[PDB]
Design a protein around this nucleic acid. Sequence first.
RNA 1: ACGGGGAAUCAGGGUUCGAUUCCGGAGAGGGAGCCUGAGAAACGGCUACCACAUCCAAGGAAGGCAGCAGGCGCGCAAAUUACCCACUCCCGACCCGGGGAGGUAGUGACGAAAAAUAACAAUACAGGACUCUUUCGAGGCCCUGUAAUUGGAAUGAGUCCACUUUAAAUCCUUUAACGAGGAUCCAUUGGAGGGCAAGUCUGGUGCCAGCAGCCGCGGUAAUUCCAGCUCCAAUAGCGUAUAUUAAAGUUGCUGCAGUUAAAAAGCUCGUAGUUGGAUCU
Lengths: 124, 56, 141, 262, 180, 129
Amino acid sequence: DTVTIRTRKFMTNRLLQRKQMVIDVLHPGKATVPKTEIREKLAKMYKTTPDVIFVFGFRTHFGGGKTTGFGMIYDSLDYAKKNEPKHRLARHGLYEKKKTSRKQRKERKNRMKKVRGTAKANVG
Amino acid sequence: GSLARAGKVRGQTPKVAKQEKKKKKTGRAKRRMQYNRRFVNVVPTFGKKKGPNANS
Amino acid sequence: GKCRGLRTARKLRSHRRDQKWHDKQYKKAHLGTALKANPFGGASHAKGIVLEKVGVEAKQPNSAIRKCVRVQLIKNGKKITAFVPNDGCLNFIEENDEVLVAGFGRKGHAVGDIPGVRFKVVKVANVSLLALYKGKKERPR
Amino acid sequence: ARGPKKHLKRVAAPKHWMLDKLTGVFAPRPSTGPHKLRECLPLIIFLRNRLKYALTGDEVKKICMQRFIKIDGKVRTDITYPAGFMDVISIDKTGENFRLIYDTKGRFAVHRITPEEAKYKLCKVRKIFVGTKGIPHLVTHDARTIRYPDPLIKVNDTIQIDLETGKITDFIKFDTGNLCMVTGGANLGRIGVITNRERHPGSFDVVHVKDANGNSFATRLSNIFVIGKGNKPWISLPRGKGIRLTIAEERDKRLAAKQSSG
Amino acid sequence: PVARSWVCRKTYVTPRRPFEKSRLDQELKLIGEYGLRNKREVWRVKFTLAKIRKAARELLTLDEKDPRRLFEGNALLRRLVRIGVLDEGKMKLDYILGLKIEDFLERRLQTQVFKLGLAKSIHHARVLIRQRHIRVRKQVVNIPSFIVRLDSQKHIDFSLRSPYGGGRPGRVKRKNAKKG
Amino acid sequence: VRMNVLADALKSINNAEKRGKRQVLIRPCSKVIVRFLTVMMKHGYIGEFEIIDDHRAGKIVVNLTGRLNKCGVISPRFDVQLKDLEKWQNNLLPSRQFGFIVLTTSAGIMDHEEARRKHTGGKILGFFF
RNA sequence: ACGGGGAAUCAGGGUUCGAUUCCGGAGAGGGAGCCUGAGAAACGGCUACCACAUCCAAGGAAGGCAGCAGGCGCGCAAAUUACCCACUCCCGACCCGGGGAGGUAGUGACGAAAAAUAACAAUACAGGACUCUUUCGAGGCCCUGUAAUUGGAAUGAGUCCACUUUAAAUCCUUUAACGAGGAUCCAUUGGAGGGCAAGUCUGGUGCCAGCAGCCGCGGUAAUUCCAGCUCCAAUAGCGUAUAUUAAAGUUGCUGCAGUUAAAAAGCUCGUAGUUGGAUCU
């Protein structure tokens, strides 16, 4: 019926101002439980708001019994925006990466290498 | 030493079309069938140990 | 008899090393004359251009015309005679087409009736002789 | 070839780091520093692979640039800083002190120490020499140059160094009957009492060391590090007390512990 | 340079004589009795048995009181009695040499779910395991060559999602019941 | 000329045992020959023997009990470590239930089993079974 | 012929391989000479010559993929002009920038691991036998096979959602929907004289065509060509060529031979080499 959540390997990382844990999601007859509701279950279980919880790396076991992932719960949203990888912040819509490919940037740099002075900014 | 006859016998062989038969079993079922034919009953033997493809 | 002494290691090893040269296989594989005289140059296969179709007469006990082809290897321009294995397979070959030729299975030795033929045609015009033989593929146009 | 190398392959790294083989091609190349490349624990290995405060090297860098880690009382921000034998790693933010010590398997154990024992360390003096207008200088295994040491202190002795001032508090002579640890070779990490040093002029001296369980072994003189006067160590020891167990004894202990634990 | 590991090994050995009639009959008897797919499974179990026997011989050539003999012989015998091939009362190194291939073939999951009455035959056992109807403890096991340990024998159930152990009708039952 | 007097002694013993004789004369004798014969005797393979003292080099009359299949020398005297002893046993001995390889070690001349018991290698002198 | 760690094979001994991700060396088209620098005789630095080659307005200028992709060429013989700095680490003045190192996907039957192509019941049929009388027969009381017999059960290949994965992604895993009776959702590659397992069945050809590693088969009844049928060998694999290992005690140290099968020098002497009698508690 309902989805169960357990936290195996819990530690309080005061160095990174967070709590890090391994999350076991018991969901016998459901698809891999979405991260957005794993976050709210963790928020209820640890008495905090669900915007400081970053869950990732969820792997369902063969047969469909349980899913194992990792999770962080930060002391504040600012410490999350400080100590979290940019992609995991972007998963929460807290960060946007540049809209340029590696090719575009590399050829832009090599084109700028051929000009000297303020004219470098005139080529893109 | 003439090369004029090169596809003589294959060319002049009366062409026969292969029949249509139900598919053979594959994998474990074929081995099960072989084991059944060779070890389960003594119906296909005579005490003379005849061969699987005996046309006699 | 042989020398059995605690200090005869050098003599024994030298004798073995000299006597290995009297083994035909060792001398063949360690002189370089066989490698330099091998038409394939040490390869397993070689591509060549058919120069003509020939009919080689089987050895004396048997009586047949084995269809072979004279092919000049692209790698070194050497002319060899390659057997066309199956029946009607010489019809699949045309003059001045490219054939992939392998050995005959006996490592530079003639095989069976065919005298002096140590190569067989494997592909003609980038299509295997077996695929043409069974109708799986047709000659490129 | 030309100039120094700057990389270290994962499989060419010291085996006591217990690194994987599938987690990348490279291992953290330790920076130049007090300890050798193959006898050190880089700060990233300690803070990520051992203590697991970080999951990636970027998190190790984040931890270190907040100035949370001190080696021998000095804040280190180099995540590849070579930390080696007897170094004190202090994290005031989480309030814990460790001493980089060897385990009987020859690996740097995670050995927690008290705040009172984090105030000092032990250093084996590597050389003593008179220089610069007659001042005696002493060089230690961690490249710490101390001027005006006690005239009794000689090479292969151990000195207790106060980490705040870097000055000698006390010293243990290299002598038979003194407790010591093995810092290299097959017997690395074992702790015992010195019984006999047999000298080889022009070659390596060999020192024989007897365990606290009666077992005896030998090492080269360079691999001995005097730990205490007599049999009492001047520093705290790991869960194992330097007594290396055989594979049979270790298997029996593991089986009994699992039987009595769960 | 890549982080990839190239470590692999062949888990079987091809026989030297390809057309030995006695060997063919023996392998076919094993295949039919234990419901194996091809000769390669027989050769695989043979290779495992041969490697175990070679290790046992190498340990037996050692001095009895040699510590490596004690340690590795104890480990090997412990593993053999752990997987049920070796009886706990027969725990000597020279008792390893007396093991057969059928001893290891009996411990397969296919043979076990046939013996425990879960399947009507050994081929039904294979198709049951391959179709995810069998679980070992809480884990749905899908491999028929899965070698069952002694402590795992008592937990071979019929799964909690299988139509035979969990009561969700399959595709065919539901489709037929729709027309009814 | 004559070399390896132990080889000649063992050849004489072997040829006399093949012929069914109850005694064999070995000449010249030596310390190695006497030690080998004693090792042979303690295992019951030859029985008692007598050393005739001529004032240049000894002779030995060995009583023969027909329990000896083959006595042989290993020339040259290969130096054998404890690891290679099993390979030498497999090569030279008819079975693992009987047969002895004789080695000269720093502890004396003895069979391979006694060499393993004393934990020593040596140089292989020969074998008997 | 880059060396080694090492690889294949291997009863014991050995034989062969090691360009190839780790360590060490060497080189950057071939030579040579240098600047800078802690470190280079550096080549994604410079200077020449030699070879090749690009642009030119003919005055000059500019080159170095044995980096990553990608072409040409060579050949029997080897993949994308893709995405990313999320991992691993490296570099910098640097918590922030950059990295074709590296990671990720694409092509991939190099190889290695697991593993489908059906399972089960009733129906009778060729059916057996410790079932029983009395061999004769009853044969759902102990199991195979005719199956274009019947019957429902099961399931994944596939298609398609939603998660999960991950730096976007893909794949695997998970969930739901559809998805199997020629379950046509149709297994192949070689063979059937011996070696060596499996037909002197039928038709065709007639020393031809061909087969055949070897021995041999084929000249009008071919167990061997060409086919059909049947059969067996391995099986998502199998055949072929070459090289190599075992077989090879046919290189023999273990462990071979030398009267006649291949072989003791015509005969002595003789230095190096190899080997060398007893004896000392």
